[PDB]
Design an enzyme around this catalytic site. Structure first.
Site, PDB file in Angstrom:
ATOM      1  N   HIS B 120       0.788  -1.208   0.000  1.00 46.51           N
ATOM      2  CA  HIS B 120       0.000   0.000   0.000  1.00 46.51           C
ATOM      3  C   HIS B 120       0.814   1.248   0.000  1.00 46.51           C
ATOM      4  O   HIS B 120       1.786   1.343   0.714  1.00 46.51           O
ATOM      5  CB  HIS B 120      -0.977  -0.028   1.161  1.00 46.51           C
ATOM      6  CG  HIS B 120      -0.336  -0.068   2.529  1.00 46.51           C
ATOM      7  ND1 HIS B 120       0.008   1.060   3.203  1.00 46.51           N
ATOM      8  CD2 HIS B 120       0.003  -1.151   3.363  1.00 46.51           C
ATOM      9  CE1 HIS B 120       0.539   0.707   4.405  1.00 46.51           C
ATOM     10  NE2 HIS B 120       0.517  -0.634   4.508  1.00 46.51           N
ATOM     11  N   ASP B 121       0.369   2.212  -0.799  1.00 44.41           N
ATOM     12  CA  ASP B 121       0.863   3.619  -0.797  1.00 44.41           C
ATOM     13  C   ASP B 121       2.251   3.774  -1.428  1.00 44.41           C
ATOM     14  O   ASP B 121       2.848   4.839  -1.375  1.00 44.41           O
ATOM     15  CB  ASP B 121       0.822   4.229   0.607  1.00 44.41           C
ATOM     16  CG  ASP B 121      -0.569   4.174   1.205  1.00 44.41           C
ATOM     17  OD1 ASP B 121      -1.471   4.824   0.649  1.00 44.41           O
ATOM     18  OD2 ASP B 121      -0.762   3.517   2.238  1.00 44.41           O
ATOM     19  N   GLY B 138       4.916  -0.952   2.763  1.00 41.89           N
ATOM     20  CA  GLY B 138       4.132   0.189   2.384  1.00 41.89           C
ATOM     21  C   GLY B 138       4.980   1.431   2.187  1.00 41.89           C
ATOM     22  O   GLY B 138       6.040   1.554   2.752  1.00 41.89           O
TER      23      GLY B 138
END
Lengths: 261, 261, 260
Positions: B120-121, B138
């Protein structure tokens, strides 16, 4: 049904009548598969790929996928697999590249655990154990009876000698001579694979000769050229170990990347 | 037909007429896919995900799955992928989190090999190579043209500079400055990415300036404060290397986890 | 609730509320309890019992046979409890008759992508296994333990309750409970203080454990001396005494030895 009705066998695939193919598996048009081989659910067998007899290929096995080499331009390169191999889940075995010899190969009686990756142009022998998430880049050679530990990575063009062992969680960037244990990041040599040689029937005299060979190669400040002279003479000592020592010096004489030290 | 009859395209998915989708693949209701992108068999494309043109997404690709962040509470966060990316098998690319900016991004012309994980991200640029089983937790930034070696892990919030290279089997817990090679567990710097830069069109004088910058930063016994001053001056030498050195010092000055040493 | 393309082999026992996604397969010896969901493409097989409220994602291989060359198709087991989250490209295998014939996972575990749990592992509850953490056979993982990503755990290693293993580590010996470890190979790096605080351990219990850590690792004691001193701390009747007792019982029962 030996072929599940949800499996897709593309026209051109050549499967022996005894081949079993599970649900949602795909076999490509340029694949040939020999007698009594089984293919598990969700697997994709593709490429210009020849598979032998009595293979047990599990679920989610990607066998014959194209090279990960940025130079690949969709050439009909090949993958050849022998007999009695066990290939588990989330595995990848790729075809060859025209820049090398156009073919990836795997022999017989191998044990290929989950997450194992065999890159383009690898040449893997027989009775090899590739433990979970062992991953080999392109053009890696792996000799008979070698064991590669789990979560290990092997650099392109590296050669792993017959009867050698790479410990788990290792990063291998040069050759492992036959009969040698290596481990670490980066991997270093740690003696002869004594336990392995014992299980395989090697005599105490053969093993003792290899221990001497290891000392000659690594523990006497000998140059590789000087070591080859001493090893060549040890190979002619008339002992049980002669053939094993000869294999060692033939491997070290032919090293591209050089050997681990 | 371009969409295999066993592929499941969920009502609401927006696919250009030229998108191809192979057997047993699934495309979710909030997915958009642009012209000439191909999705291989068994792949699951999901989330609030936008995919560009001319992408080659292989088999068993998990694209747009939810974050592995225990704070995630099913927010409709996003994944954006550009054009001309190659994404291979057993890959995972996750949507963003509302705690950051709600998006994971990949640019164009990237080469994403099997077993690669983009958490994520993450913010990934263009022309990046992520080799087999490279895994990014992440919030990792990856600059244009960077190369990440196989079986390497990158800690959350690490930044990987443009044109840098991380060796295989490395563990990266601090930033790699642009133009730098690093390797090891943990990863340490090992000079400028000289041959990479040359093949990409960097002039001899630009590379020489970057070699000098590397010595200033790492080899000359300077404090970080002293190195930043000297780098800022080198960036104003009036040579071909000025812009590259400026990018280097601007990166060093913006580091939050610090740079590798 | 069951997608028409899912294959539920006759014999499988699914609670009425179980959901099973497209192209998934559930074998004939599998049991799945209430409100558990199985994502697309997953294969749930073996003599496998799965509890309630589990969320199993896509491409999850659950109940696959051991990767032990000695396995000869015996009806060995996998048991998974309740409220576990299991992500993509995971492998969890059944046990072997050479151990106790069963692989076990408790409750409330967080099992990320690419995690591998080998035959005969015994995983407690509230455990986090981060992406691509891989455990060979017969690994024991205590409650609340966290294993970082891209780490490998050697067969027969025990990870103590409330311990932590950093990412990219290779663990070849036991992590005592309450300890932080990291590296290839992994070495101890103090008490998991932040973990213990979040879980309700008192300041006195934490100070006892820090004292225990020094006794074990920092005070130049032999193992035998450290064990006696840890036992004496455990007998002294302070807050933390039970925790120290758990530590010494763990160190006393180690087969592979503890990390140092």
């Amino acid at each position: 049904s030996r072929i599940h009705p949800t499996a897709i066998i593309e026209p051109g695939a050549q499967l022996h009548e005894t081949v079993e193919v599970g649900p949602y598996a795909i076999v490509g048009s340029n694949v040939t598969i020999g007698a009594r081989t089984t293919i598990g659910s969700h697997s994709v067998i593709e490429g210009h790929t020849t598979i032998g007899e009595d293979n047990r290929i599990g679920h989610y096995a990607s066998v014959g996928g194209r090279p990960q080499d940025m130079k690949y331009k969709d050439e009909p390169t090949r993958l050849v697999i022998g007999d009695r191999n066990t290939i588990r889940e989330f595995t990848t075995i790729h075809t060859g590249t025209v820049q090398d010899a156009g073919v990836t190969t795997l022999g017989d009686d191998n044990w290929i655990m989950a997450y194992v990756h065999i890159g383009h142009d690898c040449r893997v022998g027989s009775h090899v154990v590739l433990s979970s998430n062992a991953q080999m880049a392109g053009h890696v050679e792996i000799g008979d009876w070698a064991i590669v530990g789990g979560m290990s990575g092997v650099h392109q063009y590296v050669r792993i000698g017959a009867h050698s062992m790479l410990g788990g969680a290792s990063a291998l960037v040069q050759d492992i001579p036959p009969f040698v244990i290596a481990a670490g990041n980066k991997a270093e040599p740690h003696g002869i694979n004594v336990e392995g040689l014992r299980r395989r029937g090697f005599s105490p005299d053969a093993i003792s000769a290899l221990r001497s060979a290891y000392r000659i190669l690594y523990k006497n400040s000998l140059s590789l050229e000087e070591a080859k002279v001493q090893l060549s003479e040890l190979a002619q000592a008339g002992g049980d170990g002669d053939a094993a020592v000869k294999a060692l010096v033939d491997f070290v004489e032919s090293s591209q990347r050089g050997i681990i030290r």
